[PDB]
Structure formats: C-alpha cells, structure tokens
Design a binder for this molecule. Sequence first.
Ligand code: V1P
Ligand code: CA
Ligand code: CA
Ligand code: ZN
Length: 368
Amino acid sequence: GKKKVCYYYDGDIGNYYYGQGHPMKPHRIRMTHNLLLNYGLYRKMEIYRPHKATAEEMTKYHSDEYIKFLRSIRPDNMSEYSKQMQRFNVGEDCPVFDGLFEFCQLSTGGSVAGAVKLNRQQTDMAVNWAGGLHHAKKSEASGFCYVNDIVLAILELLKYHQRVLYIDIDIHHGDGVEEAFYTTDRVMTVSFHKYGEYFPGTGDLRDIGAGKGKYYAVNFPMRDGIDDESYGQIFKPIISKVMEMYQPSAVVLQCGADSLSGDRLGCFNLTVKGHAKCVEVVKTFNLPLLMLGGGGYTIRNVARCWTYETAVALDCEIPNELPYNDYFEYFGPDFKLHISPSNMTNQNTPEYMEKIKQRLFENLRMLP
Ligand SMILES: CCC(O)(O)CCCCC[C@H](NC(=O)C1CN(C)C1)c1[nH]c(-c2ccccc2)nc1C(N)=O
Ligand SMILES: [Ca+2]
Ligand SMILES: [Ca+2]
Ligand SMILES: [Zn+2]
C-alpha cells in the first residue's frame, strides 16, 4: 500500500550558480521544493537536511587526487590549476564556480543519507532531487557532474543488499554509473536514452557488460520524439523482465527530467504523466527505492515533474491547478501542473521499439 517517504533537501542548494549561459540551474531544486511545499506534500514526508559529505566519503569511489583537487580549486586560484583542470575535465561543461565543493557535498550527502536510511529499514523510499549526477567518473568530471552521488549511494546499498538495480530515465546515457559497475553482477544498470550524434556518445544496445558483469548492463537506444505511448509500451515490460530475472533487493531510479517535451537540451516528447509512469512502475515492485534527480533544463517543467513524482511516491493526488508559490510567474501562461506534448515527429517507430525490446529480452534470457 502507501509507503513512508524521506526527502532530502538543503535550503542553500538553489544558490549555487554554474555561470552565465550554463544550462544547469540548481535553482530548479528550490522551485521543486517550494512547489511541493505549497501543494502540502510536506505533511506526509519526513524532511531531512543532508550532511555535507566528506572528501573521505567521496573517496569510497573517486580518486584521492581528484577529490583533493575539487576541495582546493576556486575561481580566485584557477590560474594555478590549469594543468589539473585539463586532467580532471574542468572547463565549459564542468566549470569552476563559487562553492563547487559544497554543492558536491550536499548533492552527495542527500544520496548517501537516503541509502543509509533505506539500509536501516527506516523508510520505504528516499528522495534526493539534488542528486542523480550520473556522468561523473572516478577521476574526471563530465557533463555538469563532478561527484557521482549515485555510485556512492549504490556502494552504500551494497553493504546490505546483494543485488542492486539502477534505472536511468534521463535523456542522456548513464555512463558514469554503467562504467563504475561494468564488470560486476552485484549491480544491474538499465539506461533508456537518446543515442546517435548525442552526448555522451555511449550506450549502444551492444554494450552489455564485461567479465562477471556480462549481461548486467542494459541500454535502450532511442531516437528523437519519443512520446508517452511509446515509452510506456517498453518501460514496464523491460523493467518487469529485469525484476523477474535479476531479483534485486534495492532499486535506485535516476529521474532526469530532460526527457520531457520542451526541454532546452532534450529532444524527447514525454509529458510529466508519461515520465512519472516510470516511477509508478518501479514503485509497484515494493522494493527499497532511492529516487534521484539529474538533468532537466526547462526549469518550470523540472519543478512540475519532480513535484508530481514526489506526489506519486506518497500516493497523494494533487490538483492540476498550481497553488500560489514563490515562483508562480515561472509557470505561466497556464499555471497548471501537467504539460502537453508538442507536434514533433516520433522517430521511434512502433516496429523499432519492439525490435530493440526483443533484442534486450534475448540478453535478459542469458542471466542465471
Ligand atoms: C545532469 C545530467 C545530464 O545528463 O543531464 C547532463 C547533460 C550534459 C550535456 C553536456 C554537453 N556537452 C557537450 O556536448 C560537449 C561538446 N564536447 C566538448 C562535450 C552540453 N554542454 C552544453 C553547454 C552549453 C552552454 C554552456 C555550457 C555547456 N550544452 C550541451 C548539450 N546541449 O548537450
Ligand atoms: Ca538514461
Ligand atoms: Ca553491471
Ligand atoms: Zn541529461
């Protein structure tokens, strides 16, 4: 039935600024929080302020030199780190900004704290909209991500769970998470993403893992314009087959909202209901679940999406009419929660969707 939900948020998160022209806006996390507060969703959740994850907690995955660099670099001393900046991929996508390290500490803190709460059996679901930064690598920042809070949260879950399932519905391939666990069968990574002339360039349907991890990485490559009908047609069947074969004891779901229609960087056509149907599908399996954020660059739609997904986690129905809130004007001209899909062509034909699903089903038959 209805589950206990723990939500992680730090009121300072919205003040971190990647810089003029950068599409990543931490302010969208504050818009989400304010909208969900004005809908009354705080009365049903346990709200926690995450601790600032230590450099030591981060080195459970990342290299000591990379974390030392992140903790040392600032806009005022950047000139002395031009060598390490190239080495760790700090530049246009992953710039040096005021409070960069503290932003990583809060993003990571929420994910690891949520994983600890799930491990202690003190909650059914844990939510950290500031997390989900799936591109960060062991010793390299990538695609607006510096510390891989997801990998750290999964390593925490692995202390009490033999098998953990990771599902990623961001429009971009979950490469950092897939790479971290590519050679192990203790984590199965499943990513649905746009593939073809698109960042990060990985996630081919033929990338299925290696060594003991062979068949434990699943990639569903998609073309522009996928809609609710098409996404829904493959998501539940694939996740059901993965649950059946893999039998995970905990799940981590990255809810990147850049897969929504009208995203500034994305080219998909999902509505908030279509995106949230993924949360409903996963929630139905009644397993300990960590829900994380990720991409999302049309910030009014990211706030709508994550507010609705928090309501889904709580089994709470909320009206389409938006309540008054601190950012009300951002939701014009309609001031409604739900969004309409665009007229863009769906390049993912029904036959293509079925064919890719059948190839993934063949790989899933190879599990023990
Ligand atoms: C948080 C998780 C997430 O998956 O959502 C992150 C998405 C990251 C997208 C990064 C992308 N970067 C690239 O395409 C650059 C081109 N190569 C040098 C790499 C990129 N960078 C930028 C960018 C634009 C303006 C200023 C800075 C970066 N746009 C894009 C783009 N349209 O794909
Ligand atoms: Ca993905
Ligand atoms: Ca794996
Ligand atoms: Zn993305």
